[PDB]
Each structure stands twice: as structure tokens, then as C-alpha cells.
């Protein structure tokens, strides 16, 4: 039923500890979770879920599995001290996602850009310029910090289509701290 | 509660600009965001009287502290405390303070090394002594902070009232420097810095004159203006070509720690000569007569055999001494720094050495060529 | 604490144990006569750093 | 020459002098051993060219050059 | 939360020391 | 239908790789599957070969719990190559280098599952100093 795998990008940055969706932010980044991919594999028992973080350049805490315990106990511990990367970031669930196995699963990268980037004007050439003739799928949430409406971060999801693409879409949740539901409702997937 | 932000408009600069936009900081209860602005206004140019009111917004923003890092935490109450400066309050509040979070984080050892600071300047040995050994066994598992590292250095290094550690205080400033990441200093701090290493290095009892200094970077960007009658000093001890006519203006830059101590200097400058000497000479005929030692060291005749016997007991030289001769013998096994230049005789010696070895190995090959087979 | 006790359990279910034996002469340096408490005798020496 | 491998460890001791900090890499020496019952191994596994004492003359010049 | 941490999170002892347990008593061969 | 001269060729790693297991664990007896590719009707290859802990009353058919089986076999394709498994370790280590009717109970099914797998017998007690 499912033709596509998972891997995740859990923010980890400093700016991470705020209130501003819920208790200390992250604390919600973890509240999808549970739902987070538990909606993912709330579908057909074959779906696989992975998990990288994104601060100090980023390590990967879970390799593509159809299991999820193993994401939430690292989850438990994902203390958030650090400035956030990307690109760099990206280009590691790129690889992790091309060492998938079963082929007929396509890829998914679901970004949590929380806390401001760093990335120059024209990332595109490396962010997008491949998921194209890799087919590969990117989504961005946007864990408030809509800096000037992230324009930078939108652009992503431009590069993005050019007819047909966005994924699910680059849905940036109001940073009214009202729950998950918009990433529990709102994502159709 | 916030009406204390709300009524501190006046009292302190940057009002509009700081305060009423901060306060919409703290509306959307935000932080460390708020954390960052307030390092910038704590480090901002001010007498620091108004240290109760920030303080107590600190406890405030502090009570849910979390986004509070512990790092920066520990950086603004030590600047609190330090522009209170009331000596007991002081104190007490660091206490309450380190205690208060006392996380396996390694903030914990910034608040001891700023309470090794704080009861620096009283009572230096009871609890001084016994704290700086407990940061430093403490500070470990994480070599890459750089910054609490530099600090317990600094401590150390403002130690130096006190005779004994002195080779280990120029071990300390040297770390300061290494580890401070950047120079990152005003050109004002960083003149005394450099004269204080500079003047420990010339007076400890090991030290000589460590070489790479010169060309180390606290010195240079920060002396080469004016005052530099120690670089001449230190140019000179690492040359040791006596040259002690620096020593009549060195002693009226600074009397006191260079007049006071002209005989261990001077010992110090006649064992580098006779060193220096001895590296000079090109290592063939390294046995030298008692004129050449007296007339590059003003010693007596008599006495160079003493000098001589002092080198190889400190253990810069690995010699023997003889007389019937009136000759004496070296071998080395201390070396010291060099230069571009100097290393130009060391790769003309390893080329002659590369092109005999070469001819040895072919002549071998050639010759004995029928039965290597 | 159960599996930590399980370990070392299966871990130590490798050793195959020695035999007991008492030395007799020092033949060499690296060579010991040596007996075992069954009765047949045999040639040895230590083994890489005794 | 005689580099079948090089071993390095990962010590972050910061620095002397007055250097910066680093990643700064360090060396330990290596040599390749053996095991018993696997030296018959690679005993039969070579046998032809047999580098022992062998023509000890011949090989002690071969050694020098 | 603290239980997801622990209900398949965690008390995987139930699984391992189980098939651990498992080996060890395989091990134990009829002859003593 | 008919077998020949026919030659087993068995890498340098393989071979070390039995040695050192059969050594091991000489007082007892080994098991290890072995891998390979079936070159052609007379030249059966092994690339490398790979051990299963010492489990059960000894060399049988217990060797081949699926469980490990598999699980070894996927994660090495993973990275290298899947060559079909072909022969086992097994190890008599003071019997010189004979097949029992156990032995041969065992590679029945083997044989079954192939058509032509090998078994080998590598000693670990007699085979020292220069001999195999
Ligand atoms: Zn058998």
C-alpha cells in the first residue's frame, strides 16, 4: 500500500527550549511523535521510519526500520543545544534514504525547521535541483521562527513541482501554541 | 510582577531601543532570544549599580530557567556579581547560585572557577589552594568548551602572587593564550598580558627563554610599538650574546622583579651563552678551550669550569669536562627553536646525506648484482 | 540486572578449562617437563608472557 | 617499503605552546602478528616464495641493499 | 511519556532474556 | 549427472577463516555454513565462508536455525554479495578427516536443498605446522 519509507529531521538546535507551541517547544516536536509516523504506519504494517537531527552538524539517531520504539527512546533524548544545519543536513537523509531497501518504497523527508538557518541565497542547486531525477520527497514544517515568512525555507518547495510536487505541502502552523492536531489533521498523508 | 520591567523604562541607556521592544520578549513568554539581548545589555558599557533589578528580573525570567542555557546562566551572574562587588554578597550568591543548579552540566565548573576568582584576593591559600586542584581535577570529558578551560587558566594565572608557581605560571599563561581561541582582547589588556609572560618566562628557575615566544603572537602585534626594552632582553637571552648593556634601562623600566634578582639573570644568561656556543660550533669540532667560554661569557679562567659544571648539572648539555687538556667535551640533548634561514644548513645536510646514500645503495646493487639474485 | 547476570552467563559457556599438571626439570629457557596429575608426562614451555 | 597499515587515535588533548585547538589525530605503532593455526595458514597459502634463511648468504646481501 | 519509555521501550528484557535464556538452555546438553 | 575430476577452489581468506574457527574452539566440534557461487558444471567456488555459534548436541542439523540464518545472510548482501550458500565448516578435531552416519545424515538434507554442495572436513589438532 505504501510505496515510500521515512526519515525524519528532529530539530535539536538551541534555540529549541521556548515556549511557543507548548511547554518547551521540542517538547511538541516529540508530540507529533506518536503520530509523528504512528499516522505513517497507521497504514499498511510494511512503512519504515527513520530519524536524523539537525544541530552540530547533525548526527543520525535511527536507521530505516519498520519499528518505532526504537525512535521514541532516542527521542526521550534529543537535548537541544547547538545551531542548526541543513543542506548538510538534507544531503545525510539523501544517502540514508538511497540505502533503503525494498526499492519499491519511495522516499520522504519530512524537514522541522525550527529554529533560523544559516542557508545562502541559491541552495536550491544542491537542496532541490536532484529530488527531481532522484524522485525524491521533501516536507517542511516550520516550528514557528517564520522569520520575514521564511521566504528562504518557501523557496525550497518552489524549486519544488515546476508542475507537480511540494510533497504534502510546507505547512507552517500558526505560531498560536494550539497543539498537533495541525500536524495531526492538517497532513492528509 | 512584570510591572517592575514595565516601570524600569528610565535608569539606564539604550530605554526605548532595549527595554520596550524586550517586553515583548518576555509577552510571548519567550527566551533565550531574551538571553542573548541580555547579554549584550549586561555587557554594555554601565557603572552596574541598578544590579538588584536585574537581578531580580533574572530570578523572574530564571523560575522556569530551562531555555536559560547554563553557560550563558553562569556567565551573567558572574558578571552580576563582579559589578556588585561587595565581597561577602558576592560570595553567598555564588554559592546559592552553583548550588541551585548543580546538573551534571559543565557550567558547574564555571561558577567554581569564579568562586576560586572571588576568594582570589583574601585568605589565598586555605580555600584558594584546595579549590583550584578541585577545578582542575573536575574539568575533564569535554576539551572542546575552550572557554571554561580559559577561564580556570586565567585564575590560575592571576595566581601568580606566590614564588613557587612560577614555571606552572608561565605553563598557565601560555595555555591562556593557546586556548583563548582567538586573541580576541583589547590591545590595552593584551600589553600587560604579554609583559607578564614575558617577564615570568626571563624569571623562572627552568625556564631560559623558550623559543617560539618570538615569533608566539601575544607578544609581537602587541610590543613592537614602544616599551619593548624586553623583547631586546628576550632576543638577547635566546641569542645570549651577553649583550648586557639592555639590562642598565631594563632595570629602570622595571626595578623591582629584574634588579632583584641580577645574579639569578645573569647565571641564567652565562648558562645560555655557553649553550648557544656550543650550538654554533659546527659539530665536528665540538670540544672548545676555556678562552673561547671566557671570552663569549666575561667570566674568570677559573671559574668556567664551575659554569661549565652547572650546565651539565641543570642538564642542557651531556658533555664531560677535562683540564690537563684545557679543552672540554660536549653532546647534546636539549634543542632549540630556529629559523627559516637555519633551516636551509639542515636541508643542504640532509640533500648531501640523500645523494651519498644513493650512491652507496647503487654501488652496492651494481657490484653484487650476480649473486643478489 | 536479569540480563546482565545472563551475559556473563552464556559469555563464560566458552572455556574449555586446562589440565593440572606439576612441572618436573627446566629443560631450556622456554622448555619445562611437565606432568599431569593423570599420570602421562609431556614437553612445555610458558606461553607468551608468564 | 614496508607500510602495510598505520594505526591513529583520536586524542582531543587541546594544546601546548600557545597553539589553537583541533581535531589533532595521533600515531601508534603497528605491526602485523600471527596466531597459531592460522601461520599454517598462510604458510600453505605461500609456499613458493619462502623469504626463511633460505640461501642465507644471498639473501643477508639482498637484506643490506 | 514515562510509559512509552518503558512499555515496548525499554523492558525489552522480555524479548531478550527471553531468547537469551533461551541459548543458555539449549546449551544444556542430556550428558552431565 | 555424473561426476569427475572436478576442482573446489577455496579463497585464501576462506581458508583462513577455517582455521581460525576450527582452532577456536578445538576440544569441541565447529559448524560454519559456507558461501559461494556455482561457477560451472565442474568448478564449484567459494568466496567466503561464515561461522554459527556452537550450539545444540554438535554438528546436525541444528546448525541451521533459520533464525540466524537468515538474519546473516540478508546483512551481508547489504554490503558485498549474496553468493548462494554452498558447503559447511565442520570440524573433527582429533578423527582425522572422516564422515560419520551423523555426518552423513546431515548433509543429506544439504544435498537435498542443492543438487552438488560440498561438505568439507577441516581438522584442527592434525593440520599444524606445514600441513593442511
Ligand atoms: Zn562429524
Given at each position: 500500500?505504501?510505496?515510500?519509507?521515512?526519515?525524519?529531521?528532529?530539530?535539536?538546535?538551541?534555540?529549541?527550549?521556548?515556549?511557543?507551541?507548548?511547554?518547551?517547544?521540542?517538547?511538541?516536536?516529540?508530540?507529533?511523535?506518536?503520530?509523528?509516523?504512528?499516522?505513517?504506519?497507521?497504514?499498511?504494517?510494511?512503512?519504515?521510519?527513520?530519524?536524523?537531527?539537525?544541530?552540530?552538524?547533525?548526527?543520525?539517531?535511527?536507521?530505516?526500520?519498520?519499528?518505532?520504539?526504537?525512535?521514541?527512546?532516542?527521542?526521550?533524548?534529543?537535548?537541544?543545544?547547538?545551531?542548526?544545519?541543513?543542506?548538510?543536513?538534507?544531503?545525510?537523509?539523501?544517502?540514508?534514504?538511497?540505502?533503503?531497501?525494498?526499492?519499491?518504497?519511495?522516499?520522504?523527508?519530512?524537514?522541522?525547521?525550527?529554529?533560523?538557518?544559516?542557508?545562502?541565497?541559491?541552495?536550491?542547486?544542491?537542496?532541490?535541483?536532484?529530488?527531481?531525477?532522484?524522485?525524491?520527497?521533501?516536507?517542511?514544517?516550520?516550528?514557528?521562527?517564520?522569520?520575514?515568512?521564511?521566504?528562504?525555507?518557501?523557496?525550497?518547495?518552489?524549486?519544488?513541482?515546476?508542475?507537480?510536487?511540494?510533497?504534502?505541502?510546507?505547512?507552517?502552523?500558526?505560531?498560536?501554541?494550539?497543539?498537533?492536531?495541525?500536524?495531526?489533521?492538517?497532513?492528509?498523508? | 510582577?512584570?510591572?517592575?520591567?514595565?516601570?524600569?523604562?528610565?535608569?539606564?541607556?539604550?530605554?526605548?531601543?532595549?527595554?520596550?521592544?524586550?517586553?515583548?520578549?518576555?509577552?510571548?513568554?519567550?527566551?533565550?532570544?531574551?538571553?542573548?539581548?541580555?547579554?549584550?545589555?549586561?555587557?554594555?558599557?554601565?557603572?552596574?549599580?541598578?544590579?538588584?533589578?536585574?537581578?531580580?528580573?533574572?530570578?523572574?525570567?530564571?523560575?522556569?530557567?530551562?531555555?536559560?542555557?547554563?553557560?550563558?546562566?553562569?556567565?551573567?551572574?558572574?558578571?552580576?556579581?563582579?559589578?556588585?562587588?561587595?565581597?561577602?554578597?558576592?560570595?553567598?550568591?555564588?554559592?546559592?547560585?552553583?548550588?541551585?543548579?548543580?546538573?551534571?552540566?559543565?557550567?558547574?565548573?564555571?561558577?567554581?572557577?569564579?568562586?576560586?576568582?572571588?576568594?582570589?584576593?583574601?585568605?589565598?591559600?586555605?580555600?584558594?589552594?584546595?579549590?583550584?586542584?578541585?577545578?582542575?581535577?573536575?574539568?575533564?570529558?569535554?576539551?572542546?568548551?575552550?572557554?571554561?578551560?580559559?577561564?580556570?587558566?586565567?585564575?590560575?594565572?592571576?595566581?601568580?602572587?606566590?614564588?613557587?608557581?612560577?614555571?606552572?605560571?608561565?605553563?598557565?599563561?601560555?595555555?591562556?593564550?593557546?586556548?583563548?581561541?582567538?586573541?580576541?582582547?583589547?590591545?590595552?589588556?593584551?600589553?600587560?598580558?604579554?609583559?607578564?609572560?614575558?617577564?615570568?618566562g626571563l624569571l623562572g628557575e627552568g625556564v631560559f627563554n623558550?623559543?617560539?615566544?618570538?615569533?608566539?603572537?601575544?607578544?609581537?602585534?602587541?610590543?613592537?610599538?614602544?616599551?619593548?626594552?624586553?623583547?631586546?632582553?628576550?632576543?638577547?637571552?635566546?641569542?645570549?650574546?651577553?649583550?648586557?648593556?639592555?639590562?642598565?634601562?631594563?632595570?629602570?623600566?622595571?626595578?623591582?622583579?629584574?634588579?632583584?634578582?641580577?645574579?639569578?639573570?645573569?647565571?641564567?644568561?652565562?648558562?645560555?651563552?655557553?649553550?648557544?656556543?656550543?650550538?654554533?660550533?659546527?659539530?665536528?669540532?665540538?670540544?672548545?678551550?676555556?678562552?673561547?667560554?671566557?671570552?663569549?661569557?666575561?667570566?674568570?679562567?677559573?671559574?668556567v669550569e664551575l659554569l661549565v659544571m652547572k650546565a651539565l648539572?641543570?642538564?642542557?648539555?651531556?658533555?664531560?669536562?677535562?683540564?690537563?687538556?684545557?679543552?672540554?667535551?660536549?653532546?647534546?640533548?636539549?634543542?632549540?627553536?630556529?629559523?627559516?634561514?637555519?633551516?636551509?644548513?639542515?636541508?643542504?645536510?640532509?640533500?648531501?646525506?640523500?645523494?651519498?646514500?644513493?650512491?652507496?645503495?647503487?654501488?652496492?646493487?651494481?657490484?653484487?648484482?650476480?649473486?643478489?639474485? | 540486572?536479569?540480563?546482565?547476570?545472563?551475559?556473563?552467563?552464556?559469555?563464560?559457556?566458552?572455556?574449555?578449562?586446562?589440565?593440572?599438571?606439576?612441572?618436573?626439570?627446566?629443560?631450556?629457557?622456554?622448555?619445562?617437563?611437565?606432568?599431569?596429575?593423570?599420570?602421562?608426562?609431556?614437553?612445555?614451555?610458558?606461553?607468551?608472557?608468564? | 617499503?614496508?607500510?602495510?597499515?598505520?594505526?591513529?587515535?583520536?586524542?582531543?588533548?587541546?594544546?601546548?605552546?600557545?597553539?589553537?585547538?583541533?581535531?589533532?589525530?595521533?600515531?601508534?605503532?603497528?605491526?602485523?602478528?600471527?596466531?597459531?593455526?592460522?601461520?599454517?595458514?598462510?604458510?600453505?597459502?605461500?609456499?613458493?616464495?619462502?623469504?626463511?634463511?633460505?640461501?642465507?648468504?644471498?639473501?643477508?646481501?639482498?637484506?643490506?641493499? | 511519556?514515562?510509559?512509552?519509555?518503558?512499555?515496548?521501550?525499554?523492558?525489552?528484557?522480555?524479548?531478550?532474556?527471553?531468547?537469551?535464556?533461551?541459548?543458555?538452555?539449549?546449551?544444556?546438553?542430556?550428558?552431565? | 549427472?555424473?561426476?569427475?575430476?572436478?576442482?573446489?577452489?577455496?579463497?585464501?581468506?576462506?581458508?583462513?577463516?577455517?582455521?581460525?574457527?576450527?582452532?577456536?574452539?578445538?576440544?569441541?566440534?565447529?559448524?560454519?555454513?559456507?558461501?559461494?557461487?556455482?561457477?560451472?558444471?565442474?568448478?564449484?567456488?567459494?568466496?567466503?565462508?561464515?561461522?554459527?555459534?556452537?550450539?545444540?548436541?554438535?554438528?546436525?542439523?541444528?546448525?541451521?536455525?533459520?533464525?540466524?540464518?537468515?538474519?546473516?545472510?540478508?546483512?551481508?548482501?547489504?554490503?558485498?554479495?549474496?553468493?548462494?550458500?554452498?558447503?559447511?565448516?565442520?570440524?573433527?578435531?582429533?578423527?582425522?578427516?572422516?564422515?560419520?552416519?551423523?555426518?552423513?545424515?546431515?548433509?543429506?538434507?544439504?544435498?537435498?536443498?542443492?543438487?552438488?554442495?560440498?561438505?568439507?572436513?577441516?581438522?584442527?589438532?592434525?593440520?599444524?605446522?606445514?600441513?593442511?
Amino acid at each position: 500500500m505504501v510505496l515510500e519509507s521515512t526519515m525524519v529531521c528532529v530539530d535539536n538546535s538551541e534555540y529549541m527550549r521556548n515556549g511557543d507551541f507548548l511547554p518547551t517547544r521540542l517538547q511538541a516536536q516529540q508530540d507529533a511523535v506518536n503520530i509523528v509516523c504512528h499516522s505513517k504506519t497507521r497504514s499498511n504494517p510494511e512503512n519504515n521510519v527513520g530519524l536524523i537531527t539537525l544541530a552540530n552538524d547533525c548526527e543520525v539517531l535511527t536507521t530505516l526500520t519498520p519499528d518505532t520504539g526504537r525512535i521514541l527512546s532516542k527521542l526521550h533524548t534529543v537535548q537541544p543545544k547547538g545551531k542548526i544545519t541543513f543542506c548538510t543536513g538534507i544531503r545525510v537523509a539523501h544517502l540514508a534514504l538511497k540505502h533503503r531497501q525494498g526499492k519499491n518504497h519511495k522516499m520522504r523527508i519530512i524537514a522541522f525547521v525550527g529554529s533560523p538557518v544559516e542557508d545562502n541565497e541559491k541552495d536550491l542547486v544542491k537542496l532541490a535541483k536532484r529530488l527531481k531525477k532522484e524522485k525524491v520527497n521533501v516536507d517542511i514544517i516550520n516550528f514557528g521562527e517564520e522569520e520575514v515568512n521564511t521566504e528562504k525555507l518557501t523557496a525550497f518547495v518552489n524549486t519544488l513541482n515546476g508542475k507537480d510536487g511540494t510533497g504534502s505541502h510546507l505547512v507552517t502552523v500558526p505560531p498560536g501554541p494550539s497543539l498537533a492536531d495541525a500536524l495531526i489533521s492538517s497532513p492528509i498523508l | 510582577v512584570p510591572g517592575f520591567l514595565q516601570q524600569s523604562q528610565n535608569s539606564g541607556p539604550g530605554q526605548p531601543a532595549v527595554w520596550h521592544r524586550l517586553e515583548e520578549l518576555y509577552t510571548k513568554k519567550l527566551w533565550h532570544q531574551l538571553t542573548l539581548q541580555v547579554l549584550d545589555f549586561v555587557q554594555d558599557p554601565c557603572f552596574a549599580q541598578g544590579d538588584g533589578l536585574i537581578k531580580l528580573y533574572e530570578n523572574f525570567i530564571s523560575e522556569f530557567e530551562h531555555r536559560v542555557n547554563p553557560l550563558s546562566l553562569v556567565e551573567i551572574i558572574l558578571h552580576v556579581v563582579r559589578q556588585m562587588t561587595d565581597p561577602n554578597v558576592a560570595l553567598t550568591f555564588l554559592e546559592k547560585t552553583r548550588e541551585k543548579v548543580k546538573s551534571s552540566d559543565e557550567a558547574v565548573i564555571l561558577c567554581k572557577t569564579a568562586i576560586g576568582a572571588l576568594k582570589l584576593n583574601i585568605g589565598d591559600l586555605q580555600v584558594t589552594k584546595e579549590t583550584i586542584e578541585d577545578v582542575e581535577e573536575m574539568l575533564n570529558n569535554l576539551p572542546g568548551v575552550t572557554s571554561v578551560h580559559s577561564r580556570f587558566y586565567d585564575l590560575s594565572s592571576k595566581y601568580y602572587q606566590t614564588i613557587g608557581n612560577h614555571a606552572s605560571y608561565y605553563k598557565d599563561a601560555l595555555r591562556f593564550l593557546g586556548c583563548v581561541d582567538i586573541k580576541d582582547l583589547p590591545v590595552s589588556e593584551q600589553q600587560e598580558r604579554a609583559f607578564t609572560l614575558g617577564l615570568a618566562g626571563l624569571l623562572g628557575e627552568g625556564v631560559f627563554n623558550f623559543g617560539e615566544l618570538l615569533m608566539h603572537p601575544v607578544l609581537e602585534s602587541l610590543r613592537n610599538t614602544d616599551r619593548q626594552w624586553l623583547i631586546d632582553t628576550l632576543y638577547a637571552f635566546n641569542s645570549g650574546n651577553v649583550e648586557r648593556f639592555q639590562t642598565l634601562k631594563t632595570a629602570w623600566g622595571q626595578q623591582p622583579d629584574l634588579a632583584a634578582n641580577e645574579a639569578q639573570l645573569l647565571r641564567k644568561i652565562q648558562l645560555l651563552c655557553l649553550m648557544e656556543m656550543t650550538f654554533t660550533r659546527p659539530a665536528n669540532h665540538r670540544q672548545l678551550t676555556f678562552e673561547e667560554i671566557a671570552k663569549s661569557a666575561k667570566i674568570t679562567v677559573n671559574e668556567v669550569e664551575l659554569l661549565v659544571m652547572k650546565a651539565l648539572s641543570v642538564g642542557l648539555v651531556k658533555g664531560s669536562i677535562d683540564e690537563v687538556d684545557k679543552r672540554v667535551h660536549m653532546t647534546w640533548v636539549q634543542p632549540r627553536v630556529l629559523d627559516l634561514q637555519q633551516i636551509k644548513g639542515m636541508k643542504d645536510r640532509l640533500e648531501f646525506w640523500c645523494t651519498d646514500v644513493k650512491s652507496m645503495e647503487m654501488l652496492v646493487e651494481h657490484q653484487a648484482h650476480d649473486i643478489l639474485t | 540486572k536479569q540480563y546482565e547476570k545472563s551475559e556473563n552467563d552464556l559469555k563464560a559457556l566458552q572455556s574449555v578449562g586446562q589440565i593440572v599438571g606439576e612441572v618436573l626439570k627446566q629443560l631450556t629457557e622456554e622448555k619445562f617437563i611437565v606432568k599431569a596429575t593423570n599420570g602421562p608426562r609431556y614437553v612445555v614451555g610458558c606461553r607468551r608472557q608468564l | 617499503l614496508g607500510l602495510p597499515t598505520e594505526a591513529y587515535i583520536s586524542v582531543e588533548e587541546v594544546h601546548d605552546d600557545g597553539t589553537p585547538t583541533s581535531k589533532t589525530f595521533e600515531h601508534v605503532t603497528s605491526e602485523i602478528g600471527a596466531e597459531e593455526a592460522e601461520e599454517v595458514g598462510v604458510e600453505h597459502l605461500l609456499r613458493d616464495i619462502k623469504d626463511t634463511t633460505v640461501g642465507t648468504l644471498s639473501q643477508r646481501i639482498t637484506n643490506q641493499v | 511519556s514515562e510509559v512509552l519509555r518503558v512499555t515496548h521501550e525499554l523492558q525489552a528484557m522480555k524479548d531478550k532474556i527471553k531468547e537469551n535464556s533461551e541459548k543458555i538452555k539449549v546449551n544444556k546438553t542430556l550428558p552431565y | 549427472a555424473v561426476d569427475t575430476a572436478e576442482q573446489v577452489y577455496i579463497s585464501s581468506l576462506a581458508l583462513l577463516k577455517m582455521l581460525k574457527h576450527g582452532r577456536a574452539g578445538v576440544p569441541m566440534e565447529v559448524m560454519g555454513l559456507m558461501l559461494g557461487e556455482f561457477v560451472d558444471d565442474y568448478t564449484v567456488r567459494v568466496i567466503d565462508v561464515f561461522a554459527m555459534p556452537q550450539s545444540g548436541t554438535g554438528v546436525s542439523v541444528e546448525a541451521v536455525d533459520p533464525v540466524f540464518q537468515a538474519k546473516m545472510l540478508d546483512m551481508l548482501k547489504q554490503t558485498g554479495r549474496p553468493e548462494m550458500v554452498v558447503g559447511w565448516y565442520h570440524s573433527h578435531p582429533g578423527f582425522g578427516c572422516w564422515l560419520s552416519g551423523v555426518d552423513i545424515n546431515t548433509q543429506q538434507s544439504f544435498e537435498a536443498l542443492s543438487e552438488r554442495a560440498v561438505a568439507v572436513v577441516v581438522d584442527p589438532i592434525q593440520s599444524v605446522k606445514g600441513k593442511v
